[PDB]
């Protein structure tokens, strides 16, 4: 079925939970043996969210190459994403090592450091120009260059220096700051505006390594971001845009990381975002 009318049909019939449970039942199951080794326990935020072995990002280190991060490679859309958990106190150096080694231009953050009164990720970037951060375990230096605070999101320019080689690179930090502590946003307008700002920066384009996107577990809000981006790109590429099937795209993405889209409300919100976005791209 088309999307917008499939959408109203699920709303009128109140069957979002059943649609979402079907997706959960059909999703891929691949091994995640490296994530479950005892030496990696303090590298995982949640015991039930792990990268598959076949798609995990490897650190360029011979001691321990493990990070909780996955490469999502979308062949028809010609887009790749790295989805990862929010960094832990003992993985902030690994996180920036990954950004460096994978040649990423941008980092997309969809959570606040504290939500619901609890810490959802480490404070992993500097908050003042004159107070830079050094990660001694991976030999990297990180400096805040500029910060632009807007009503729904903040964009930061950061300098990452490999202290071994003295090479430097400019990294863009796109921070969506207004996702509610509970539930999903009422309108997708600010989330779509944010997606378009990431696109306009070059951070999603083939002349760079894959964008790094995270929330707390790296599967819920993060899954919504890449699902909406890929569906909109496919609607632009194909002769028949109504052929794009958001459930089929989501199951394809779940071949590369488990659990993408965590609730039926997140699934409905993803539909809403793609539907509204497809009108702005053109003219209705
Ligand atoms: C004087 O301490 C400088 C610490 N630089 C960074 C600060 C952020 N870090 C954590 C674990 O939160 C990792 C080390
Ligand atoms: C039955 O018609 C459904 C049309 N789907 C539309 C077709 C045009 N689209 C775009 C993005 O050009 C969005 C999807």
Curated annotation (Swiss-Prot):
GO annotations of cellular component type: cytoplasm; cytoplasmic side of endoplasmic reticulum membrane; cytosol; early endosome; endoplasmic reticulum; endosome lumen; glutamatergic synapse; mitochondrial crista
Main localization, broad class: endoplasmic reticulum
Catalytic activity: O-phospho-L-tyrosyl-[protein] + H2O = L-tyrosyl-[protein] + phosphate
Cysteine sulfinic acid (-SO2H) modified-residue sites: 215
EC class name: hydrolase
Disulphide bridges, residue numbers: none
Cross-link (N,N-(cysteine-1,S-diyl)serine (Cys-Ser)): 215-216
Ranges for domain Tyrosine-protein phosphatase: 3-277
Positions carrying S-nitrosocysteine: 215
Modified residues (Phosphoserine): 50, 242-243
Consequence of substituting residue 50 to A/D: No phosphorylation
Residue positions, PTM Cysteine sulfenic acid (-SOH): 215
Alphabetic keyword roster: Acetylation, Endoplasmic reticulum, Hydrolase, Membrane, Oxidation, Phosphoprotein, Protein phosphatase, S-nitrosylation
Membrane topology according to the record: Peripheral membrane protein
Post-translational note: Oxidized on Cys-215; the Cys-SOH formed in response to redox signaling reacts with the alpha-amido of the following residue to form a sulfenamide cross-link, triggering a conformational change that inhibits substrate binding and activity. The active site can be restored by reduction.
Subcellular localization, as worded in the UniProt entry: Endoplasmic reticulum membrane
Residues recorded with modification N-acetylmethionine: 1
E.C. numbers: 3.1.3.48
Tissues where the protein occurs: Expressed in keratinocytes (at protein level).
Modified positions (Phosphotyrosine) in chain numbering: 20, 66
Quaternary structure annotation from Swiss-Prot or TrEMBL: Interacts with EPHA3 (phosphorylated); dephosphorylates EPHA3 and may regulate its trafficking and function. Interacts with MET. Interacts with NCK1.
Family: Belongs to the protein-tyrosine phosphatase family. Non-receptor class 1 subfamily.
Protein function: Tyrosine-protein phosphatase which acts as a regulator of endoplasmic reticulum unfolded protein response. Mediates dephosphorylation of EIF2AK3/PERK; inactivating the protein kinase activity of EIF2AK3/PERK. May play an important role in CKII- and p60c-src-induced signal transduction cascades. May regulate the EFNA5-EPHA3 signaling pathway which modulates cell reorganization and cell-cell repulsion. May also regulate the hepatocyte growth factor receptor signaling pathway through dephosphorylation of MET.
Protein name: Tyrosine-protein phosphatase non-receptor type 1
Naturally occurring in which organism (per UniProt): Homo sapiens
Gene that encodes the chain: PTPN1
